[PDB]
PDB file of all heavy atoms in Angstrom:
ATOM      1  N   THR Q   1     166.967 121.706 113.510  1.00 31.58           N
ATOM      2  CA  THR Q   1     165.706 122.362 113.114  1.00 31.58           C
ATOM      3  C   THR Q   1     165.352 122.056 111.701  1.00 31.58           C
ATOM      4  O   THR Q   1     166.144 122.349 110.794  1.00 31.58           O
ATOM      5  CB  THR Q   1     165.826 123.891 113.374  1.00 31.58           C
ATOM      6  OG1 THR Q   1     165.897 124.111 114.748  1.00 31.58           O
ATOM      7  CG2 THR Q   1     164.678 124.603 112.760  1.00 31.58           C
ATOM      8  N   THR Q   2     164.217 121.471 111.505  1.00 34.24           N
ATOM      9  CA  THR Q   2     163.729 121.172 110.136  1.00 34.24           C
ATOM     10  C   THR Q   2     162.897 122.332 109.562  1.00 34.24           C
ATOM     11  O   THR Q   2     161.936 122.743 110.202  1.00 34.24           O
ATOM     12  CB  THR Q   2     162.933 119.898 110.148  1.00 34.24           C
ATOM     13  OG1 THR Q   2     163.772 118.798 110.704  1.00 34.24           O
ATOM     14  CG2 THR Q   2     162.579 119.481 108.747  1.00 34.24           C
ATOM     15  N   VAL Q   3     163.334 122.876 108.426  1.00 33.47           N
ATOM     16  CA  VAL Q   3     162.656 123.968 107.721  1.00 33.47           C
ATOM     17  C   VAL Q   3     162.175 123.433 106.393  1.00 33.47           C
ATOM     18  O   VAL Q   3     162.970 122.984 105.560  1.00 33.47           O
ATOM     19  CB  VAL Q   3     163.607 125.181 107.552  1.00 33.47           C
ATOM     20  CG1 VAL Q   3     163.008 126.218 106.610  1.00 33.47           C
ATOM     21  CG2 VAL Q   3     163.879 125.905 108.857  1.00 33.47           C
ATOM     22  N   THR Q   4     160.854 123.522 106.153  1.00 32.67           N
ATOM     23  CA  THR Q   4     160.220 123.116 104.930  1.00 32.67           C
ATOM     24  C   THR Q   4     159.758 124.358 104.180  1.00 32.67           C
ATOM     25  O   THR Q   4     158.996 125.159 104.728  1.00 32.67           O
ATOM     26  CB  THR Q   4     159.008 122.187 105.178  1.00 32.67           C
ATOM     27  OG1 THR Q   4     159.407 121.091 106.059  1.00 32.67           O
ATOM     28  CG2 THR Q   4     158.475 121.649 103.871  1.00 32.67           C
ATOM     29  N   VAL Q   5     160.177 124.525 102.933  1.00 33.16           N
ATOM     30  CA  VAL Q   5     159.747 125.611 102.069  1.00 33.16           C
ATOM     31  C   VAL Q   5     158.764 125.083 101.052  1.00 33.16           C
ATOM     32  O   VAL Q   5     159.121 124.278 100.181  1.00 33.16           O
ATOM     33  CB  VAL Q   5     160.964 126.313 101.378  1.00 33.16           C
ATOM     34  CG1 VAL Q   5     160.425 127.394 100.462  1.00 33.16           C
ATOM     35  CG2 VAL Q   5     161.871 126.919 102.420  1.00 33.16           C
ATOM     36  N   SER Q   6     157.543 125.576 101.103  1.00 35.03           N
ATOM     37  CA  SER Q   6     156.479 125.091 100.233  1.00 35.03           C
ATOM     38  C   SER Q   6     155.464 126.170 100.017  1.00 35.03           C
ATOM     39  O   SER Q   6     155.098 126.918 100.947  1.00 35.03           O
ATOM     40  CB  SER Q   6     155.768 123.882 100.858  1.00 35.03           C
ATOM     41  OG  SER Q   6     154.725 123.418 100.014  1.00 35.03           O
ATOM     42  N   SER Q   7     154.926 126.225  98.781  1.00 37.59           N
ATOM     43  CA  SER Q   7     153.814 127.128  98.468  1.00 37.59           C
ATOM     44  C   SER Q   7     152.511 126.721  99.125  1.00 37.59           C
ATOM     45  O   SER Q   7     151.678 127.567  99.355  1.00 37.59           O
ATOM     46  CB  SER Q   7     153.593 127.272  96.959  1.00 37.59           C
ATOM     47  OG  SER Q   7     153.302 125.972  96.426  1.00 37.59           O
ATOM     48  N   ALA Q   8     152.371 125.476  99.475  1.00 36.36           N
ATOM     49  CA  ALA Q   8     151.197 124.944 100.183  1.00 36.36           C
ATOM     50  C   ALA Q   8     151.211 125.367 101.645  1.00 36.36           C
ATOM     51  O   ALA Q   8     152.239 125.793 102.157  1.00 36.36           O
ATOM     52  CB  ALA Q   8     151.171 123.434 100.122  1.00 36.36           C
ATOM     53  N   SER Q   9     150.085 125.227 102.260  1.00 32.58           N
ATOM     54  CA  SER Q   9     149.852 125.558 103.654  1.00 32.58           C
ATOM     55  C   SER Q   9     149.496 124.320 104.409  1.00 32.58           C
ATOM     56  O   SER Q   9     149.132 123.284 103.796  1.00 32.58           O
ATOM     57  CB  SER Q   9     148.818 126.649 103.802  1.00 32.58           C
ATOM     58  OG  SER Q   9     147.564 126.182 103.322  1.00 32.58           O
ATOM     59  N   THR Q  10     149.503 124.439 105.726  1.00 33.71           N
ATOM     60  CA  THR Q  10     149.560 123.307 106.659  1.00 33.71           C
ATOM     61  C   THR Q  10     148.236 122.569 106.756  1.00 33.71           C
ATOM     62  O   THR Q  10     147.180 123.155 106.836  1.00 33.71           O
ATOM     63  CB  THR Q  10     149.943 123.837 108.050  1.00 33.71           C
ATOM     64  OG1 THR Q  10     150.982 124.796 107.920  1.00 33.71           O
ATOM     65  CG2 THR Q  10     150.503 122.725 108.876  1.00 33.71           C
ATOM     66  N   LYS Q  11     148.324 121.213 106.749  1.00 34.86           N
ATOM     67  CA  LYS Q  11     147.170 120.349 107.023  1.00 34.86           C
ATOM     68  C   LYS Q  11     147.459 119.558 108.279  1.00 34.86           C
ATOM     69  O   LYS Q  11     148.509 118.927 108.404  1.00 34.86           O
ATOM     70  CB  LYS Q  11     146.880 119.434 105.852  1.00 34.86           C
ATOM     71  CG  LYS Q  11     145.774 118.457 106.088  1.00 34.86           C
ATOM     72  CD  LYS Q  11     144.437 119.067 106.157  1.00 34.86           C
ATOM     73  CE  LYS Q  11     143.384 118.079 106.545  1.00 34.86           C
ATOM     74  NZ  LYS Q  11     143.291 116.959 105.579  1.00 34.86           N
ATOM     75  N   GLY Q  12     146.497 119.577 109.187  1.00 30.62           N
ATOM     76  CA  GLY Q  12     146.604 118.761 110.394  1.00 30.62           C
ATOM     77  C   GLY Q  12     146.481 117.247 110.102  1.00 30.62           C
ATOM     78  O   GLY Q  12     145.830 116.886 109.119  1.00 30.62           O
ATOM     79  N   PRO Q  13     147.031 116.420 110.976  1.00 29.64           N
ATOM     80  CA  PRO Q  13     146.893 114.978 110.803  1.00 29.64           C
ATOM     81  C   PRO Q  13     145.671 114.413 111.413  1.00 29.64           C
ATOM     82  O   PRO Q  13     145.117 114.923 112.373  1.00 29.64           O
ATOM     83  CB  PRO Q  13     148.140 114.469 111.553  1.00 29.64           C
ATOM     84  CG  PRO Q  13     148.375 115.458 112.641  1.00 29.64           C
ATOM     85  CD  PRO Q  13     147.980 116.809 112.066  1.00 29.64           C
ATOM     86  N   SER Q  14     145.214 113.281 110.839  1.00 29.76           N
ATOM     87  CA  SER Q  14     144.085 112.527 111.334  1.00 29.76           C
ATOM     88  C   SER Q  14     144.592 111.249 112.006  1.00 29.76           C
ATOM     89  O   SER Q  14     145.337 110.473 111.403  1.00 29.76           O
ATOM     90  CB  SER Q  14     143.140 112.178 110.174  1.00 29.76           C
ATOM     91  OG  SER Q  14     142.791 113.342 109.475  1.00 29.76           O
ATOM     92  N   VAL Q  15     144.233 111.069 113.288  1.00 28.77           N
ATOM     93  CA  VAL Q  15     144.734 109.897 114.056  1.00 28.77           C
ATOM     94  C   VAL Q  15     143.638 108.865 114.233  1.00 28.77           C
ATOM     95  O   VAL Q  15     142.553 109.146 114.777  1.00 28.77           O
ATOM     96  CB  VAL Q  15     145.247 110.395 115.425  1.00 28.77           C
ATOM     97  CG1 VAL Q  15     145.592 109.222 116.334  1.00 28.77           C
ATOM     98  CG2 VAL Q  15     146.495 111.296 115.193  1.00 28.77           C
ATOM     99  N   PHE Q  16     143.889 107.681 113.731  1.00 31.08           N
ATOM    100  CA  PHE Q  16     142.953 106.531 113.768  1.00 31.08           C
ATOM    101  C   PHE Q  16     143.626 105.379 114.466  1.00 31.08           C
ATOM    102  O   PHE Q  16     144.761 105.031 114.119  1.00 31.08           O
ATOM    103  CB  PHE Q  16     142.475 106.165 112.388  1.00 31.08           C
ATOM    104  CG  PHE Q  16     141.897 107.289 111.588  1.00 31.08           C
ATOM    105  CD1 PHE Q  16     142.455 107.741 110.414  1.00 31.08           C
ATOM    106  CD2 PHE Q  16     140.768 107.921 112.075  1.00 31.08           C
ATOM    107  CE1 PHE Q  16     141.895 108.793 109.682  1.00 31.08           C
ATOM    108  CE2 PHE Q  16     140.180 108.976 111.376  1.00 31.08           C
ATOM    109  CZ  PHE Q  16     140.768 109.380 110.178  1.00 31.08           C
ATOM    110  N   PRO Q  17     142.978 104.660 115.401  1.00 33.07           N
ATOM    111  CA  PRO Q  17     143.680 103.617 116.109  1.00 33.07           C
ATOM    112  C   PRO Q  17     143.678 102.294 115.332  1.00 33.07           C
ATOM    113  O   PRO Q  17     142.676 101.891 114.738  1.00 33.07           O
ATOM    114  CB  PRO Q  17     142.851 103.473 117.419  1.00 33.07           C
ATOM    115  CG  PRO Q  17     141.464 103.924 117.025  1.00 33.07           C
ATOM    116  CD  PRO Q  17     141.645 104.939 115.962  1.00 33.07           C
ATOM    117  N   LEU Q  18     144.846 101.646 115.326  1.00 29.95           N
ATOM    118  CA  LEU Q  18     144.938 100.313 114.713  1.00 29.95           C
ATOM    119  C   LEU Q  18     144.573  99.288 115.822  1.00 29.95           C
ATOM    120  O   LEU Q  18     145.394  99.056 116.696  1.00 29.95           O
ATOM    121  CB  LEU Q  18     146.308 100.028 114.140  1.00 29.95           C
ATOM    122  CG  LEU Q  18     146.657 100.988 113.024  1.00 29.95           C
ATOM    123  CD1 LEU Q  18     148.131 100.915 112.681  1.00 29.95           C
ATOM    124  CD2 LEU Q  18     145.792 100.793 111.821  1.00 29.95           C
ATOM    125  N   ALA Q  19     143.401  98.715 115.713  1.00 29.24           N
ATOM    126  CA  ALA Q  19     142.719  97.940 116.731  1.00 29.24           C
ATOM    127  C   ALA Q  19     143.512  96.641 117.005  1.00 29.24           C
ATOM    128  O   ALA Q  19     143.781  95.931 116.026  1.00 29.24           O
ATOM    129  CB  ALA Q  19     141.317  97.627 116.299  1.00 29.24           C
ATOM    130  N   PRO Q  20     143.808  96.360 118.288  1.00 29.48           N
ATOM    131  CA  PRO Q  20     144.585  95.133 118.648  1.00 29.48           C
ATOM    132  C   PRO Q  20     143.927  93.813 118.155  1.00 29.48           C
ATOM    133  O   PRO Q  20     142.680  93.724 118.108  1.00 29.48           O
ATOM    134  CB  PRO Q  20     144.581  95.169 120.178  1.00 29.48           C
ATOM    135  CG  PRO Q  20     144.525  96.605 120.478  1.00 29.48           C
ATOM    136  CD  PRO Q  20     143.515  97.132 119.498  1.00 29.48           C
ATOM    137  N   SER Q  21     144.784  92.866 117.815  1.00 28.38           N
ATOM    138  CA  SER Q  21     144.514  91.838 116.752  1.00 28.38           C
ATOM    139  C   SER Q  21     143.342  90.937 117.199  1.00 28.38           C
ATOM    140  O   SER Q  21     143.374  90.344 118.275  1.00 28.38           O
ATOM    141  CB  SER Q  21     145.768  90.978 116.489  1.00 28.38           C
ATOM    142  OG  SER Q  21     145.570  90.020 115.501  1.00 28.38           O
ATOM    143  N   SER Q  22     142.267  91.088 116.392  1.00 26.67           N
ATOM    144  CA  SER Q  22     141.090  90.257 116.565  1.00 26.67           C
ATOM    145  C   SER Q  22     141.438  88.781 116.493  1.00 26.67           C
ATOM    146  O   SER Q  22     141.085  87.958 117.355  1.00 26.67           O
ATOM    147  CB  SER Q  22     140.048  90.594 115.516  1.00 26.67           C
ATOM    148  OG  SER Q  22     139.015  89.623 115.509  1.00 26.67           O
ATOM    149  N   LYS Q  23     142.145  88.434 115.388  1.00 23.99           N
ATOM    150  CA  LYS Q  23     142.563  87.079 115.130  1.00 23.99           C
ATOM    151  C   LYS Q  23     143.600  86.698 116.198  1.00 23.99           C
ATOM    152  O   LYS Q  23     144.514  87.453 116.498  1.00 23.99           O
ATOM    153  CB  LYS Q  23     143.161  86.975 113.696  1.00 23.99           C
ATOM    154  CG  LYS Q  23     142.947  85.631 113.049  1.00 23.99           C
ATOM    155  CD  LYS Q  23     144.014  84.608 113.363  1.00 23.99           C
ATOM    156  CE  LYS Q  23     143.954  83.312 112.580  1.00 23.99           C
ATOM    157  NZ  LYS Q  23     145.239  82.627 112.670  1.00 23.99           N
ATOM    158  N   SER Q  24     143.409  85.511 116.789  1.00 25.69           N
ATOM    159  CA  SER Q  24     144.295  85.003 117.815  1.00 25.69           C
ATOM    160  C   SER Q  24     145.580  84.542 117.120  1.00 25.69           C
ATOM    161  O   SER Q  24     145.556  83.666 116.232  1.00 25.69           O
ATOM    162  CB  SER Q  24     143.696  83.876 118.567  1.00 25.69           C
ATOM    163  OG  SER Q  24     142.307  84.020 118.767  1.00 25.69           O
TER     164      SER Q  24
END
């Protein structure tokens, strides 16, 4: 179990797709 102690509060992640390779 990972426990993080921080004065900050939680930020959700942003998911962006890495587009399959244009260049052959």
